[PDB]
Symmetry: C5
Subunit: 333 residues, 5 copies
């Protein structure tokens, strides 16, 4: 009977003060939370933030909304949520979050006979994640979503994960093009500020970055250019022009590769591992050119010593570069 249900809803909402929390002046209202992660849209190191779309649901108990005589759970229209009390839950570290509004506001209100209220939203947020990219791209990020009550202290509200360790779902279905979610954690605690103690929930992901693309697109050209520089040591004895032309081509190619690659890398202004590796390759080709210059300078007066120096460099350069490569791949793994 629609008229009877309308009468019940009007009776519930009449004399109902939306400005007062449930059990005002009494025990805090326990609010449980569920997060169904639809998808992690993207992760950006330039802005150091990740975009996250989720179904965020809050469960609590408002005795003023308890009804009797109806053996049903009333799934009301979303607009009635504007006439109820809802927790002032906000995301601590978000930068731009919104609730989808097509074709209507993605909002669900479900009343229960015992006064229990379920309130669901579909939120696309952009949470800030500070990233330690000193080991980029061989890095590992820990990005968290923080949930807190904005106004009410722990004396008026409490947050708990509804469902224990399985309160957050959908993480296993996330397809991140570059990262792999190694682990996710749920944390509940109380934080302290000048006004008092606030409840706090935290959903943490550990993202591990794939390195195949960097290996097959970033390091390999530099290694090949270094080998091409090494080729110079086995070019004639008096090729004062062809050998220096090969070195010139090597240096110009190294500069072009570094410039274009840094263009194809995030513009974050601090030293990274790939920057160190490219600097090392540049220093190595520069040292090869310096060795050629010194050999050419001493070639006319002491040809035997020049040839000996060239032969010794033929071994020293690959060995020193391999030592540097080993210490680099062991320092960053």
């Amino acid at each position: 009977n629609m008229s009877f249900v309308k009468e019940t809803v009007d009776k519930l909402l009449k004399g109902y003060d939306i400005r007062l929390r449930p059990d005002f002046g009494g025990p805090p209202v326990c609010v449980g939370m569920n997060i169904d992660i639809a998808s992690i849209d993207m992760v950006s190191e330039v802005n150091m933030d990740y975009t996250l779309t989720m179904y965020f649901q809050q469960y609590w108990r408002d005795k003023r909304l308890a009804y009797s005589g109806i053996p049903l759970n009333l799934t009301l229209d979303n607009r009635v949520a504007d006439q109820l009390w809802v927790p002032d839950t906000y995301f601590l570290n978000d930068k731009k979050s919104f609730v989808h509004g097509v074709t209507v506001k993605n909002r669900m209100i479900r009343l229960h006979p015992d006064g229990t209220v379920l309130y669901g939203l579909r939120i696309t947020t952009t949470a800030a994640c500070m990233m330690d990219l000193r080991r980029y791209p061989l890095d590992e990020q820990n990005c968290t979503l923080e949930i807190e009550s904005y106004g009410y202290t722990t004396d008026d509200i409490e947050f708990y994960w509804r469902g224990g360790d399985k309160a957050v779902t959908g993480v296993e279905r996330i397809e991140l093009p570059q990262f792999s979610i190694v682990e996710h954690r749920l944390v509940s605690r109380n934080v302290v500020f000048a006004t008092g103690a606030y409840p706090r929930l935290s959903l943490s992901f550990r993202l591990k970055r794939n390195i195949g693309y960097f290996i097959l697109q970033t390091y390999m050209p530099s290694i090949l250019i270094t080998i091409l520089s090494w080729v110079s040591f086995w070019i004639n004895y008096d090729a004062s022009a062809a050998r220096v032309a090969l070195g010139i081509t090597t240096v110009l190619t190294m500069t072009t590769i570094n410039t274009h690659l840094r263009e194809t890398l995030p513009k974050i202004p601090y030293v990274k591992a790939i920057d160190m590796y490219l600097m090392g390759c540049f220093v190595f080709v520069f040292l090869a050119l310096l060795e050629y210059a010194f050999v050419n300078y001493i070639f006319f007066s002491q040809p035997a010593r020049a040839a000996a120096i060239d032969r010794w460099s033929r071994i020293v350069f690959p060995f020193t570069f391999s030592l540097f490569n080993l210490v680099y791949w062991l320092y960053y793994v």
Copy 2:
């Protein structure tokens, strides 16, 4: 008689409760749906999403809105839609969507004497499509648009296509630049979540990326540079300058092509077939240059051995390149 129509409408809306679905507590309301796709703006591989503009239409029946004495269809102003009940339909896999509002909100409400309601919106949505670019650019994508009620379960609402396979129209007129609509499919089903069973409609497009410019511009340069690296072998000593020029040209052109195609392609992190093809061609030409360097170094010592190495390279390099190309092509096509 506008006065009589206005009185009838006022009687219809007097006592109407938008917080209660039609036939509340009884059978679920069957909501039929039509989509008329105006156009698809773009299918971005970088963000893995596609923009779609459509004339979404919902058809249902609310017996509270049935009117008598007017043997016509009441095409009311869109604002009356705020005073009625509308389903909480939302697109499950959208990242941003809006209803156009110029000059007025693009919205149509039509009432029939038997309580039938037709509700039209003009919606532009950026729906997420997780592409698979392993076989890029010869891959075939499948991008879907999902439609699902938010709050009401199957006990309160049911979805179906109004017109069978003719429910969605305008697909054949989609002017996609880089894709072609191979086939569009309409699916209806139910999905069980922790909160119950919900209806689901799906509109899926299969897109075959046009080979075209990709074949005509990407693989051919690499093949030609490999052919040049081959023809660099049939060089005697007196034409050594020409061989040096050919080798340097091959290396520089390969590097420039690699950088250009890694800068002017959708910046997806993970590797793909084209990347492996380009790296293989680079490796082949680099190894050809290394072979020339070894031949030049050992030419003075044992010219017969150097000539034998040159001839064996002439025999082997095209054969190995052809084997690599065939295994790559049958591994991806």
Copy 3:
């Protein structure tokens, strides 16, 4: 008497029903439309759309608003437009449009003694224009703005241009940095959909691109680089290093030019005219380098043959390039 005018307006708006169109259940209400174009902000080929700012004016006759005793055209505050029926006019091919709202909403309501209503808005609309860049940058586009009633069919409303071909003004004052408006047309007709017949207005512009910037930026440097690559023919063959360096550097310059210019071009899936010209220049310079390689290979055997080949090249390359330029410029113009 301001109070008397207030009483008259209140009497006009007392009992007025916005949800019902004028002449409801009778002849369709004729609406005459004027457009005063302010400027065309941009015409993006990347997004294939143009931004257009205009004053959109609608003219109809709602006899429910007819008043007597005040021989003046009542210019009312724009907010009263929220209390009147206005046509659900929308733009068929827009993507993102809005009405400026600073300092107030750019909206104008003017009532006339015979019930005539004039309703003006200032609209900035991004209309999609699916271009044809096969002849880029010598193309001639045709971009249209489509105006249609959303909910009401031709039985309820009938659009027409108020003033004939003079219904659209401000075309001559449009300042397009790149294009030049050749012609504009106004079309009025009816279009049939499954929901009935709808009025349709179309405002079409034909835009002709200006090629001077592309002439100086691209077409001249490519020609100069090709002519410079032709220099190697006059250089004596015995100076192998000079010709090798010239060919390699011309190839590298052409590669850099092509890469930068393509990166400054959209990713449409077909080859434009400028791409054809750049590819032709690249082919010419690469062929000159290969011709030098062939001459340096065969000069040891038959020096007279090599000299004859060079003397033939000095005529063939300029003649072939002149023929290529002639066919390219005649084909596209």
Copy 4:
């Protein structure tokens, strides 16, 4: 007495008709405008528009709001501006303007005992400024802001700058990194349209561009490269490789500079002064290389003629470049 002030304000607003302008049916209302420019955020040549943040104040007299018994100016809350008549003032040439809304809407209403109303807003407008970049980067631009009534005509409203030439303040404190505000002018007039005459105010700035950055980073590298190209003439003509490499690498460096400058400089579909200068330098280096080619071709038969041509080139090329620079700098300054 707060209650007495509340009663007076309510009596002022009781029976107030916001739909009618003050003194309706009589003399037009006089609106005096002040602008206090906080900053000019940016100037963009790509979009040809400038961002402008201002305090915009309007002064008029509505005798319906006159009150007695309170010898004080009533600074009311901004929300009361939604209950008062305000002029429909808009900016004729803006594209995206808004009123700031943190913490509250930046808006001020001040009522005077004689009924005078002062209405202040904080507006950030992106105004469209057409620019003549024929003399970029040596150009001087003129950017205007147009203020006009939308609905009311000269028979209903009249604009005048309040304070004469001191109406607009804050101009001297504007800090444009690239421009310098030479002058600003205030103009008041009437514009005729099909709907009658409308008041119009215009605040115009004349901005002169700073050229130090363009001298350091743009002209100087080109001049240095052109000078470096002349090194070829002071090298012995038998060293074919050295001079060929010099000419071709100068051409390559000039191409790199030109392309990267075009990428960095704002996009424009026409020819600028800087482009003319770059093309001139390119022509000079191209002619230097061509002259060297002529010398290398004719040196064997007539070494005396080759030496004479080299001496004439040494005399002419610096002289011709100096003359070209002198005429270029005299024409554009």
Copy 5:
């Protein structure tokens, strides 16, 4: 008893007039402001602005809201903030600011028994901060946040930091990668405009840029290229091709590095210190090439003088560059 609290609140708001400030026509209302800074999202030199997120809390006393019988602080729902009077506080140097509204408007209202009101917001604002980038990338910037009453003068409202110097917290926790916060200052004063005197609060940060990234990616390549241009000196002057090619290769590499760095570095329209350093390095390599040109011109007639010139240059160029670098690093540090 929640009904008692509801009655108390209704009595508080019975007849409350939001349009009137507390003690209207009396002493000015003291507003104490606290700021809890969460993070600084970015600091931009292209736009000269920084993004700041903060908990902004205002403290004042409204006697109209004083209540008795409830010995507790009433933390109300944020929506009640629309039913009270709040200061028209705004930020004087902001460009785009908003209050986060997920899952609700991040806003807090707390009423104290003595009528004291605490009103908190969570605000993200893009505050303009003009920068003196002459010493970039070794500069120290000063960015200020200005807080002022928009409509009320010092006769009606007074701003003061609440808690003394401890009014702003969270500064030490700001994680800026590129910059490093040195000192933050709080200033309180009154400014005088044409209308009257307005209160003003200012929060100033002094940021110091970090130069390690610039040193290891922007200065070292130039230093290495200059050292290579030096090593060009030790080649005997007879070899024209080698020295000429090395000098011009250094010039071309310097130009490419400069252009790609200007692309990667911020695009500000005026001169910095890095630009002067790059111009100095370019001048050094240019002078090295010119010196070799002079030596190659005079080597045949004056071999002793040419040898002496080379020997002297081998010490002069390193010494001159060392002096230039010492001057540069002492001037800017």
